[PDB]
């Protein structure tokens, strides 16, 4: 009756939160996602989990979800909890276009989701979302952007982003090797294959363990390029020369 | 034990103790018996005076459900009052939807399913009552029913509810009830109440006798025992 009470909503005696601190720990035990700005683009990179040789991968996108027309999102956390969000997130951006006949400007989409994600920590004893996820896009007012969702509902606009206990050490590389102002795509693509070489501890960086999607503003279209496996190979072979140069300065 | 809080849980051997607990709360209630003759049903209730300020016919346990149906409750009295209003209300819908009097075999089914629903959920408890149902008709004869707190309901020829449930039907069964008239039954009910526990651990009691059958023309009402007083004139002759 009353004695089956789950907590989900109760402060600490010191003042911290009970479930929200626990839900952010599961995201460290998940895949790896990141992104970086450019002067003329933005990209995403993902780590493949469960790369066993009896699967199909016929969706052509597993971590990436092209959501409006010019925005996509990565995902990290509980996979089954994430399908509730993305079907909701696609419908927020679409009911906006019915209302104003202009695309959603890439911030108030995020606040529309983050107020839903917050509301399970408030009223109604329920389980919060154990999903953090990224954002890429383009608008009229600011251009290329990155955002960072949290289970608490907090968000921030970044220029290089993070997944935690999996890959918190990548940001230490990102604070070391991200130059400000000039950040173009081939400089950014060569950066990301170096970062995932460190964090994803697969030796020699098998090309089927990664996934890269980019976004470029092109002639008034904002194409979303989910690049195929043939050019992941030459991206690795570009990084293969950087090993040979790394010993010349000894 | 440690499995017996809710009525929605099973024991590790497969029963529900909340139903088991509520049955033996009826056991502490005073004895009320019932018996049917070949042309009617006669009720009888041993009812004890609280102190002295009872006013001679207050809070009676002989109810009157329909034109021809009444109850002989025992247990928690206030719980039986609400349960009697279910049976009063149930017969009115059968009258309004079908245009004739409720059969007693169908009336006991509608009540016992309603008693059954309080034995399932954790939000409510089982009833702490058990009772009798007697009626008479010319197309059906007389019937006598019996409903426990679990909801099991079927028919008897004689029954007893209270402390002396076993000690009363030990001497109900030595009667040739298949051929007696119910006017002969009324003086025979009087001794069975009066045999068991007049004033041994209690102080005083008072007798109540309900009465339905062919002599009442299908009506159900209390006996005229203010008329002729023949119960106590004949039950008290068993002193020797």
């Amino acid at each position: 009756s009353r004695r089956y009470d789950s907590r989900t909503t109760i402060f600490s005696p010191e003042g911290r939160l009970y479930q929200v601190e626990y839900a952010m720990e599961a995201i460290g035990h998940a895949g790896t996602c990141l992104g970086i700005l450019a002067n003329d683009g933005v990209l995403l990179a993902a780590e493949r989990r469960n790369i066993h040789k009896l699967l199909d991968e016929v969706f052509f996108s597993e971590k990436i979800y092209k959501l409006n027309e010019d925005m996509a999102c990565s995902v990290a956390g509980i996979t089954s909890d994430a399908n509730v969000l993305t079907n909701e997130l696609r419908l927020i951006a679409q009911r906006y276009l019915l209302q104003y006949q202009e695309p959603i400007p890439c911030e108030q989409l995020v606040t529309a989701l983050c107020d839903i994600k917050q509301a399970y920590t408030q009223f109604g004893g329920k389980r919060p979302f154990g999903v953090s996820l990224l954002y890429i896009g383009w608008d009229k007012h600011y251009g290329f952007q990155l955002y960072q969702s949290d289970p608490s509902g907090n968000y921030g606009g970044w220029k290089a982003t993070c997944i935690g206990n999996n890959s918190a050490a990548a940001v230490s590389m990102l604070k070391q090797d991200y130059k400000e102002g000039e950040m173009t795509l081939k400089s950014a693509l060569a950066l990301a294959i170096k970062v995932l070489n460190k964090t994803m501890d697969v030796s020699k960086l098998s090309a089927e363990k990664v996934e890269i999607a980019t976004l470029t503003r092109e002639n008034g279209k904002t194409v979303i390029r989910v690049l195929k496996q043939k050019e992941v190979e030459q991206l690795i072979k570009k990084h293969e020369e950087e090993e040979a140069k790394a010993e010349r300065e000894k | 034990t440690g499995y017996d809080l809710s009525a929605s849980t099973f024991s590790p051997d497969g029963r529900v103790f909340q139903v088991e607990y509520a049955m033996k709360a009826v056991e502490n209630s005073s004895t009320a018996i019932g018996i049917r003759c070949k042309d009617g049903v006669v009720f009888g209730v041993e009812k004890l005076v609280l102190s002295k300020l009872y006013e001679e016919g207050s809070n009676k346990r002989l109810f009157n459900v329909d034109r021809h149906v009444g109850m002989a409750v025992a247990g928690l009295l206030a719980d039986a009052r609400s349960l009697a209003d279910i049976a009063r209300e149930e017969a009115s819908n059968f009258r309004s939807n079908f245009g004739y009097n409720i059969p007693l075999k169908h009336l006991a089914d509608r009540v016992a399913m309603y008693v059954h629903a309080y034995t399932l959920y954790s939000a409510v408890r089982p009833f702490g009552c058990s009772f009798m149902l007697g009626s008479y008709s010319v197309n059906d004869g007389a019937q006598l029913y019996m409903i426990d707190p679990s909801g099991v309901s079927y028919g008897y020829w004689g029954c007893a509810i209270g402390k002396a449930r076993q000690a009363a039907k030990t001497e109900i069964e030595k009667l040739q009830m298949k051929e007696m008239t119910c006017r002969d039954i009324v003086k025979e009910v009087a001794k069975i109440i009066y045999i068991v526990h007049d004033e041994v651990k209690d102080k005083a009691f008072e007798l109540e006798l309900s009465w339905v059958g062919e002599l009442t023309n299908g009506r159900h009402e209390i006996v005229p025992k203010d008329i002729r007083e023949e119960a106590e004139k004949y039950a008290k002759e068993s002193l020797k």
């Binding site: 959501l67 696609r90 276009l97 | -």
Partner: protein
């Protein structure tokens, strides 16, 4: 009538490997025009359009609700929509307002997304679909458009003669109508490209 409150005319016609669609340009209340650039043909993906005619409220309203349901469809499925699937989608949207109906009559024209196969259909104001093989028309000046298309249509036509047939059909039928005119726009689409032309019509 309510259909005669603003006028309008939408025509589609099937060719050999191509399909053409045309409409007028006039927007106006019952007798007074307002503007000559009112859109009545809306793109729904590539090589697949739709035309609307009737009450100008429900023209703009249905075209926004249908675009709402299309973009949710093309994201749960990576493929684009088939022309039969759109016709079943529109007829569902109209029949939901069975007793409060939208006052419009759509016309759908387009090619197959995989093969080259053309497709034309039109619907009623409550959603009775109707596929043909030659032409469909809708609007106030319906009977004028039947008289032109029954005489000028040929079975297998190149995109040159398909353009000239639907031009002569729309120019002669609309000039006989009073509440339709002020310019005619023509979309002719095919497997390789999409051609949009506007014709020299009577502006009276």
């Amino acid at each position: 009538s309510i259909m005669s409150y603003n006028g309008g005319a939408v025509m589609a016609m099937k060719g050999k490997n191509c399909v053409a669609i045309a409409a007028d340009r006039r927007f106006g209340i019952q007798a007074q025009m307002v503007t000559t650039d009112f859109q009545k043909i809306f793109p729904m993906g590539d090589r697949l359009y739709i035309g609307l005619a009737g009450l100008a409220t429900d023209v703009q309203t249905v075209a926004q609700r249908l675009k709402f349901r299309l973009n949710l469809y093309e994201l749960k499925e990576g493929r684009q929509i088939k022309p039969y699937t759109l016709m079943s989608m529109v007829a569902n949207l109209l029949y939901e307002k069975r007793f409060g109906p939208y006052y419009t009559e759509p016309v759908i024209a387009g090619l197959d997304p995989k093969t080259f196969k053309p497709f034309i259909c039109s619907l009623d104001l409550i959603g009775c679909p109707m596929v043909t093989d030659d032409f469909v028309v809708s609007g106030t000046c319906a009977e004028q458009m039947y008289g032109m298309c029954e005489s000028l249509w040929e079975p297998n036509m190149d995109p040159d003669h398909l353009f000239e047939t639907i031009s002569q059909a729309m120019l002669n039928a609309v000039d006989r109508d009073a509440v339709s005119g002020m310019g005619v726009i023509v979309h002719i689409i095919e497997k390789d490209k999409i051609t949009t032309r506007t014709l020299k019509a009577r502006m009276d």
